[PDB]
Design an enzyme around this catalytic site. Structure first.
Site, mmCIF file in Angstrom:
data_model
loop_
_atom_site.group_PDB
_atom_site.id
_atom_site.type_symbol
_atom_site.label_atom_id
_atom_site.label_comp_id
_atom_site.label_asym_id
_atom_site.label_seq_id
_atom_site.Cartn_x
_atom_site.Cartn_y
_atom_site.Cartn_z
ATOM 1 N N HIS A 110 0.746 -1.259 0.000
ATOM 2 C CA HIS A 110 0.000 0.000 0.000
ATOM 3 C C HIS A 110 0.784 1.322 0.000
ATOM 4 O O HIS A 110 0.177 2.401 -0.069
ATOM 5 C CB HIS A 110 -1.169 -0.044 0.980
ATOM 6 C CG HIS A 110 -2.429 -0.430 0.262
ATOM 7 N ND1 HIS A 110 -3.354 0.529 -0.142
ATOM 8 C CD2 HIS A 110 -2.800 -1.632 -0.239
ATOM 9 C CE1 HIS A 110 -4.266 -0.131 -0.846
ATOM 10 N NE2 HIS A 110 -3.970 -1.425 -0.937
ATOM 11 N N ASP A 161 -8.486 3.149 8.351
ATOM 12 C CA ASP A 161 -9.762 3.183 7.605
ATOM 13 C C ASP A 161 -9.893 1.956 6.706
ATOM 14 O O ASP A 161 -11.002 1.567 6.353
ATOM 15 C CB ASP A 161 -9.844 4.444 6.710
ATOM 16 C CG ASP A 161 -9.825 5.756 7.480
ATOM 17 O OD1 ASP A 161 -10.234 5.756 8.661
ATOM 18 O OD2 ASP A 161 -9.410 6.787 6.891
ATOM 19 N N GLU A 170 -14.091 11.532 12.461
ATOM 20 C CA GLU A 170 -13.396 11.862 11.220
ATOM 21 C C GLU A 170 -14.187 12.990 10.530
ATOM 22 O O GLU A 170 -15.163 13.499 11.070
ATOM 23 C CB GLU A 170 -13.203 10.638 10.297
ATOM 24 C CG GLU A 170 -12.133 9.656 10.750
ATOM 25 C CD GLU A 170 -11.577 8.729 9.682
ATOM 26 O OE1 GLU A 170 -10.945 7.715 10.051
ATOM 27 O OE2 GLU A 170 -11.781 9.004 8.480
HETATM 28 C C1 LIG Z 1 -3.496 1.922 0.182
HETATM 29 C C2 LIG Z 1 -4.110 2.450 1.454
HETATM 30 C C3 LIG Z 1 -3.276 2.857 2.493
HETATM 31 C C4 LIG Z 1 -3.792 3.384 3.684
HETATM 32 C C5 LIG Z 1 -5.192 3.488 3.837
HETATM 33 C C6 LIG Z 1 -6.028 3.071 2.797
HETATM 34 C C7 LIG Z 1 -5.515 2.563 1.610
HETATM 35 C C8 LIG Z 1 -6.471 2.209 0.494
HETATM 36 N N1 LIG Z 1 -5.776 3.968 5.009
HETATM 37 C C9 LIG Z 1 -4.979 4.290 6.004
HETATM 38 C C10 LIG Z 1 -5.569 4.761 7.224
HETATM 39 O O1 LIG Z 1 -6.756 4.986 7.408
HETATM 40 N N2 LIG Z 1 -4.660 5.018 8.235
HETATM 41 C C11 LIG Z 1 -3.291 4.853 8.152
HETATM 42 O O2 LIG Z 1 -2.605 5.051 9.161
HETATM 43 N N3 LIG Z 1 -2.737 4.442 6.986
HETATM 44 C C12 LIG Z 1 -3.532 4.194 5.955
HETATM 45 N N4 LIG Z 1 -2.969 3.785 4.772
HETATM 46 C C13 LIG Z 1 -1.502 3.852 4.612
HETATM 47 C C14 LIG Z 1 -0.814 2.585 5.114
HETATM 48 O O3 LIG Z 1 -0.815 2.542 6.543
HETATM 49 C C15 LIG Z 1 0.620 2.484 4.586
HETATM 50 O O4 LIG Z 1 0.598 2.288 3.174
HETATM 51 C C16 LIG Z 1 1.561 1.464 5.234
HETATM 52 O O5 LIG Z 1 2.783 1.433 4.499
HETATM 53 C C17 LIG Z 1 0.991 0.067 5.408
HETATM 54 O O6 LIG Z 1 0.679 -0.595 4.162
HETATM 55 P P1 LIG Z 1 1.297 -2.081 3.905
HETATM 56 O O7 LIG Z 1 1.042 -3.034 5.011
HETATM 57 O O8 LIG Z 1 0.861 -2.396 2.486
HETATM 58 O O9 LIG Z 1 2.880 -2.098 3.970
HETATM 59 P P2 LIG Z 1 3.954 -1.711 2.796
HETATM 60 O O10 LIG Z 1 3.317 -0.573 2.073
HETATM 61 O O11 LIG Z 1 4.286 -3.002 2.035
HETATM 62 O O12 LIG Z 1 5.325 -1.334 3.476
HETATM 63 C C18 LIG Z 1 5.410 -0.045 4.146
HETATM 64 C C19 LIG Z 1 6.784 0.142 4.743
HETATM 65 O O13 LIG Z 1 6.929 -0.721 5.898
HETATM 66 C C20 LIG Z 1 7.912 -1.713 5.647
HETATM 67 N N5 LIG Z 1 7.435 -2.977 6.206
HETATM 68 C C21 LIG Z 1 6.410 -3.763 5.745
HETATM 69 N N6 LIG Z 1 6.110 -4.766 6.535
HETATM 70 C C22 LIG Z 1 7.025 -4.651 7.573
HETATM 71 C C23 LIG Z 1 7.284 -5.455 8.704
HETATM 72 N N7 LIG Z 1 6.668 -6.616 8.944
HETATM 73 N N8 LIG Z 1 8.256 -5.045 9.555
HETATM 74 C C24 LIG Z 1 8.940 -3.931 9.268
HETATM 75 N N9 LIG Z 1 8.818 -3.124 8.209
HETATM 76 C C25 LIG Z 1 7.835 -3.543 7.392
HETATM 77 C C26 LIG Z 1 8.166 -1.701 4.134
HETATM 78 O O14 LIG Z 1 9.465 -2.167 3.782
HETATM 79 C C27 LIG Z 1 7.948 -0.216 3.821
HETATM 80 O O15 LIG Z 1 9.111 0.551 4.113
HETATM 81 O O1 LIG Z 2 -6.831 6.430 3.110
HETATM 82 C C1 LIG Z 2 -7.428 6.697 4.147
HETATM 83 N N1 LIG Z 2 -8.835 6.566 4.261
HETATM 84 C C2 LIG Z 2 -9.715 6.213 3.213
HETATM 85 C C3 LIG Z 2 -11.064 6.530 3.352
HETATM 86 C C4 LIG Z 2 -11.960 6.271 2.312
HETATM 87 C C5 LIG Z 2 -11.493 5.667 1.149
HETATM 88 C C6 LIG Z 2 -10.128 5.374 0.997
HETATM 89 O O2 LIG Z 2 -9.571 4.685 -0.106
HETATM 90 C C7 LIG Z 2 -10.074 4.914 -1.391
HETATM 91 F F1 LIG Z 2 -10.111 6.227 -1.626
HETATM 92 F F2 LIG Z 2 -9.234 4.333 -2.249
HETATM 93 F F3 LIG Z 2 -11.298 4.372 -1.503
HETATM 94 C C8 LIG Z 2 -9.253 5.639 2.039
HETATM 95 N N2 LIG Z 2 -6.729 7.185 5.270
HETATM 96 C C9 LIG Z 2 -5.317 7.347 5.205
HETATM 97 C C10 LIG Z 2 -4.459 7.794 6.202
HETATM 98 N N3 LIG Z 2 -3.180 7.810 5.822
HETATM 99 N N4 LIG Z 2 -2.900 7.415 4.571
HETATM 100 S S1 LIG Z 2 -4.294 7.041 3.867
#
Ligand SMILES: *Cc1cc2c(cc1C)nc1c(=O)[nH]c(=O)nc-1n2C[C@H](O)[C@H](O)[C@H](O)COP(=O)(O)OP(=O)(O)OC[C@H]1O[C@@H](n2cnc3c(N)ncnc32)[C@H](O)[C@@H]1O
Ligand SMILES: O=C(Nc1cccc(OC(F)(F)F)c1)Nc1cnns1
Length: 447
Positions: A61, A124, A235
């Site tokens: 993500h 979220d 929110e």
């Molecule tokens: C795509 C997205 C992201 C998102 C979200 C909604 C969507 C549609 N809503 C969020 C929300 O309401 N609140 C919030 O705090 N974040 C939100 N996000 C963002 C999301 O938290 C971040 O994208 C985050 O990176 C987690 O996503 P994901 O689990 O896919 O992890 P990644 O993107 O592959 O890696 C992120 C970084 O962390 C390192 N990594 C990954 N796993 C680990 C472990 N196990 N240990 C240590 N480091 C780790 C990766 O290497 C990278 O640097």
């Molecule tokens: O992304 C959210 N919330 C969030 C809320 C509604 C929809 C959504 O994803 C979408 F747009 F693709 F449908 C994401 N919160 C985040 C906080 N930090 N990075 S993203």
């Protein structure tokens, strides 16, 4: 016990993320069976002559290649036996041990089916890994009250940049524990996280109300987060009409509180200043409310509007400067939502690596716009808008801090952390990842 893969589909997935821009390819993808496999791979990277890049991938993500390991190895942490939730008389509550790559949606289903328990603090979107969100903060409508997900974890198992498996908490190796939390994958890979749990509500009273006045909207959000009757989730979002603000709140309930939920909602709403006759209410199960974004994802996927570039920008804005954000950004600078809601800094442990503004109350301002499919010029115009928002913050001296920071230059990282936090961050890197093997896609350190 692990497996190295050179499968083109495995390489392609590890070379992309939700952002849709950064495309750094690894040499291989590693599929671990357990923590020891992760230790073995990082250990070999640490011992190798060149010291190849190793990065954990959660659900991919990231917006700008944070989980990419150029010419190295991506560890696919996605999922064996799961630990059952446990009760502790010393902590006075429940916890559950989860694999670092476990998705929050799978954690929720597991805890609910084993005692009707659930985490207290969410994101979220639930299709995110535990390791991924804990490396940032993990924020949603509960953070004002319970703090982010990094404030709701008792213990970790971490594979350091030297391939050593370390158990850490507040009372055991605290420097590694607090460093890893919000640490951007810099000090190790989370293989186990011990998540705090509460008795889960059964249902949710989900409310939305509209405001045309930004001063009234922010004043209401700030009062709601200070609240003992209170909402369980706070929110908000910016909506095109000129510009309207939608307050989003919830009231959690179960069989015991079902009889008082209607009065509690009415009492709390009566104290607010939303536009009359703009209240919209839904009553639904707790799982359904928490999974609401996955339902939006399924509709977007069917329209071919999910696998598009996402130039997302997340800012933490001090509450003292939020007013200037209305005419300056929402009415000034500006498909996709704009999220807005305040949080309480005291719910954030200052020992963690997480960077928040130097104010008791600060807002998340999330620009979640999608570029038009197959249209590179759409992504370019949105990227220019993001730079104009950053230039606005810099030019007017707003002490904003990026959440999921997209910086890549040394002085930009120094300015982001500040001298004291930067010094602590660099010292933890020298101790835990001296060769800068881990999460090099974050672009903070070099070998
Ligand atoms: C795509 C997205 C992201 C998102 C979200 C909604 C969507 C549609 N809503 C969020 C929300 O309401 N609140 C919030 O705090 N974040 C939100 N996000 C963002 C999301 O938290 C971040 O994208 C985050 O990176 C987690 O996503 P994901 O689990 O896919 O992890 P990644 O993107 O592959 O890696 C992120 C970084 O962390 C390192 N990594 C990954 N796993 C680990 C472990 N196990 N240990 C240590 N480091 C780790 C990766 O290497 C990278 O640097
Ligand atoms: O992304 C959210 N919330 C969030 C809320 C509604 C929809 C959504 O994803 C979408 F747009 F693709 F449908 C994401 N919160 C985040 C906080 N930090 N990075 S993203």
């Amino acid at each position: 016990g692990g497996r190295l893969s050179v499968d083109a589909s495995d390489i392609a997935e590890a070379s992309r993320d939700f952002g849709g821009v950064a495309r750094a390819e690894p040499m291989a993808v590693f599929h671990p069976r357990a923590a020891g496999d992760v230790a073995g791979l990082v250990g070999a990277a640490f011992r190798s002559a060149r010291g190849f890049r190793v990065s954990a991938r959660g659900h991919g993500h990231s917006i700008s290649g944070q989980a990419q390991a150029a010419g190295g190895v991506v560890v696919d942490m996605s999922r064996v036996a799961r630990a059952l939730p446990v009760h502790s008389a010393a902590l006075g509550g429940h916890y559950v041990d989860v694999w670092g790559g476990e998705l929050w949606v799978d954690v929720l289903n597991w805890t609910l089916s084993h005692g009707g328990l659930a985490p207290r603090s969410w994101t979220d979107y639930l299709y995110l890994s535990v390791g991924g969100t804990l490396s940032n903060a993990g924020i949603s409508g509960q953070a004002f009250h319970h703090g982010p997900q990094i404030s709701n974890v008792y213990e970790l198992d971490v594979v350091t940049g030297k391939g050593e498996v370390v158990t850490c908490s507040e009372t055991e190796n605290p420097d590694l524990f607090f460093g890893v939390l919000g640490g951007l994958g810099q000090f190790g890979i989370i293989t186990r996280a011990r998540i705090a749990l509460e008795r889960a509500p059964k249902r949710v009273r989900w409310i939305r109300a509209l405001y045309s006045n930004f001063s009234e909207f922010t004043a209401d959000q700030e009062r709601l987060i200070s609240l003992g009757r209170r909402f369980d989730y706070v929110e908000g979002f910016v909506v095109a009409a000129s510009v309207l603000y939608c307050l989003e709140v919830t009231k959690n309930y179960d069989d015991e509180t079902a009889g008082s939920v209607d009065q509690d909602v009415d009492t709390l709403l009566g104290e607010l200043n939303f536009l009359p006759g703009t209240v919209f209410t839904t009553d639904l199960p707790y799982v359904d409310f928490l999974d609401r974004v996955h339902k939006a994802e399924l509709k977007l996927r069917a329209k071919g509007m999910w696998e598009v570039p996402h130039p997302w920008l997340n800012l933490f804005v001090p509450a003292s400067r939020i007013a200037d954000f209305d005419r300056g950004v929402f009415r000034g600078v500006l498909g996709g939502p704009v999220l807005i809601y305040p949080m309480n800094k005291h719910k954030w442990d200052p020992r963690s690596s997480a960077v928040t503004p130097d104010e008791e109350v600060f807002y998340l301002v999330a620009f979640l716009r999608s570029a038009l499919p197959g249209a590179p010029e759409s992504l370019e115009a949105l990227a220019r808008q993001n730079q104009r928002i950053l230039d606005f913050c810099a030019g007017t001296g707003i002490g904003a801090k990026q959440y999921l920071p997209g910086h890549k230059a040394r002085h930009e990282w120094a300015e982001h952390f500040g001298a004291a936090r930067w010094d602590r961050f660099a010292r933890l890197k020298a101790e835990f990842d001296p060769r800068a093997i881990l999460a090099a896609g974050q672009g903070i350190f070099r070998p």
